[PDB]
Amino acid sequence: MVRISIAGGNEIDPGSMGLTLFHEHLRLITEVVRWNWPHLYNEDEELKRAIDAVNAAKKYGVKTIIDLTVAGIGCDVRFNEKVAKATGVNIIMGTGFYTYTEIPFYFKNRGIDSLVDAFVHDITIGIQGTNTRAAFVKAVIDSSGLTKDVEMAIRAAAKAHIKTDVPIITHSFVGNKSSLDLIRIFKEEGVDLARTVIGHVGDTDDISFIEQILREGAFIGLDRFGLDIYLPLDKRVKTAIELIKRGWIDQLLLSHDYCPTIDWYPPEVVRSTVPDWTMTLIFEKVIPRMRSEGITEEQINRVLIDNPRRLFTG
Amino acid sequence: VRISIAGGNEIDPGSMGLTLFHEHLRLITEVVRWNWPHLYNEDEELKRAIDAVNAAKKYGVKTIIDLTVAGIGCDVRFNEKVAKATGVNIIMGTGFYTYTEIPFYFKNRGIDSLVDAFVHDITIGIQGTNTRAAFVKAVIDSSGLTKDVEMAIRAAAKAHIKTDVPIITHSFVGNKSSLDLIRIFKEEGVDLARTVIGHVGDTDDISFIEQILREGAFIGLDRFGLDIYLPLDKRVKTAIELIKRGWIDQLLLSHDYCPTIDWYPPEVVRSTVPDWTMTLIFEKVIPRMRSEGITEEQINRVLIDNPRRLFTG
Ligand SMILES: CCCCCCCC(=O)CC(=O)N[C@H]1CCOC1=O
Ligand SMILES: CCCCCCCC(=O)CC(=O)N[C@H]1CCOC1=O
Ligand SMILES: [Co+2]
Ligand SMILES: [Co+2]
Ligand SMILES: [Co+2]
Ligand SMILES: [Co+2]
């Protein structure tokens, strides 16, 4: 009975998601740069890179990818439709506003409701003039902390969840404990935390801090496998195995946050700095290592199939 | 000098004629337009832009310099439609409009990547077209000189040094940020005669204004009709006084008019600055200045020769 729009305006139910990567990207670009300086980009090559990435995940049994690209990081339904068509993978899209500091004057001068309404439109009508609806909302906080504008956008994500019941999938930054501001704001807004992911929690191996989040009842995103600059692979794998052994499995989500294009850094820089980052590292290295430490096949399926499904059905 | 105008034709500075040096055709926020097109109507935007430029045209305006750059919604194709419907020359530029931050794309690559982007626009073309940028914009406002704002100002200066296009600025007089533009341009070796210090008309403080003028730059008395920044009568008195005090060759007049501005609902704009248009200088400013002894030829020096000299030096 829950219906999830997917890139192309089809719908699936949560039961047919199957093996899912809950936080990945197809193309991460900056709208104001791309609009004004198209010569710095190449759409054919972006498309090839996203297709190649998704096909690689698909060879390992991925059926569904949740694209966490929203406004501010270059969301494009038409791009995603080409990717979906070429690959046959389900692509789930969302809404929200991605920022660490400021929001546009457009919404600041109109008030929080204007931002909620834009999100609700994407969820109930469709994204960017299409019939693909947003099936989740994103809230973002980072190293600048809880600025007024960031607070507004997090609260607008919350209010949009209260009106539509779509899950809230977040970005946080663990070094300043911003993860906890998400939870506090969500509690104030009456959000059921079981319908939320506190993101980028896998960027720390501090288990007591992770449990402080877990005891509030939310999902956590162990979601940057392959980005050693946030936390090395060995510590991420160790953390995930330990959290399963301690009884936290129903709250764990795994992903790579992989960006087949990311315009924030030259591609040479990304290759030099995180050469292991792909959309398949979980299947190549993480799962084999977890299996060798006693994690079961069914535990892996609970994480990669049942948890993403339950985020969408409750 | 050859000046590209929207459409990729080129004009020489002599053919600019009566020029509005700081206006807009459409001021919108790229990230919002890209993500929520349902909040916009392109036919209506076009119509408002055309109507505004045709009103100006009625008063003899031949050329409008569109100060819309990256950050506030610049679109060559939109402008080409306006140019073609109206017959008015539209001159475009490049730069990055921000009061605080610049994109990660540029911050992680460094200053040269932003310079090169501007230079691309000036020497090859804007947005895949053959309309080249004819000026570069630099911006500072009430947040002051942040690190990113400083970078973008210095990048505009460096692009000016490579290409010799003029620099038309935005500043905020309330914190004296106008003076940071000046200091930075001097450090970069810019001839200030090739620059406009923008939004100076937002104050009637003669001493502050003369501090800028003695540096040799043009000043933008460029928001006629925005009473919320400064009432029309103070703007008019200030312009008359500056002419009388000998500064005519450094004065530029405009309205900063936005036929669309997505920062505010249209009803709030109508309600707050109902006299804001792209023709108020012709309807009210010029008749008041003439009644105070300002001559016809003085008016032409400000509205014809000054914009020309900005492009020729
Ligand atoms: C030198 C920097 C090396 C490149 C590392 C890549 C950094 C990232 O791309 C992290 C990242 O993805 N942050 C953004 C993009 C996905 O959504 C986010 O929150
Ligand atoms: C509260 C309602 C304010 C109504 C008028 C707002 C007018 C402006 O926003 C002036 C303005 O355009 N400033 C921006 C945009 C043109 O270049 C600028 O720097
Ligand atoms: Co993130
Ligand atoms: Co991400
Ligand atoms: Co301005
Ligand atoms: Co302006």
Numbering used by the authors:
A (entry chain B): 1 to 314
B (entry chain A): 2 to 314
Which sentences from the paper describe this structure?
VmoLac (YP_004245953) is a recently identified enzyme that was isolated from the hyperthermophilic crenarchaeon Vulcanisaeta moutnovskia strain 768-2833. The phylogenetic tree that was built from this sequence alignment, indicates that VmoLac belongs to the clade of the PLLs-A. Kinetic characterization indicates that VmoLac is a proficient lactonase with promiscuous, poor esterase and phosphotriesterase activities. As expected, VmoLac is roughly globular and exhibits a (β/α)8 barrel topology that is similar to that of others PLLs such as SsoPox17, SisLac8, DrOPH3, GsP10 and GkL36.
The structure of VmoLac bound to its substrate 3-oxo-C10 AHL enabled us to identify the specific interactions of the enzyme with the bound lactone. Crystals of VmoLac were soaked with 3-oxo-C10 AHL, and the lactone sits in the hydrophobic channel of the active site. The omit density map cannot be confounded with that of the fatty acid, since the bound lactone is shorter, and the lactone ring is visible in the electronic density map. The lactone ring sits on the bi-metallic active site, while the carbonyl oxygen is bound to the β-Co (2.4 Å), and the esteric oxygen contacts the α-Co (2.4 Å). The carbonyl oxygen of the lactone ring also interacts with the Y98 O-H (2.3 Å) and the R224 guanidinium group (3.5 Å). The 1-oxo group weakly interacts with C259 (3.7 Å), and the long aliphatic chain sits in the hydrophobic channel that is formed by loop 8. The overall binding of the 3-oxo-C10 AHL is very similar to the previously observed binding of a lactone mimic, the inhibitor C10 homocysteine lactone in the SsoPox structure. A deeper comparison highlights the fact that the lactone ring is closer to the bi-metallic center in the VmoLac structure compared to the thiolactone ring in SsoPox. Moreover, the difference in the loop 8 conformation between both enzyme yield to a very different binding crevice, where very different residues are involved in the substrate binding, such as Y265VmoLac/T265SsoPox, V274VmoLac/A275SsoPox, T273VmoLac/L274SsoPox, and also V269VmoLac, V270VmoLac, A266SsoPox and Y270SsoPox. This different crevice results in the aliphatic chain binding outside loop 8 in VmoLac, whereas it binds inside loop 8 in SsoPox17. We surmise here that the hydrolysis mechanism of lactones by VmoLac is therefore close to those that have been previously proposed for SsoPox17.
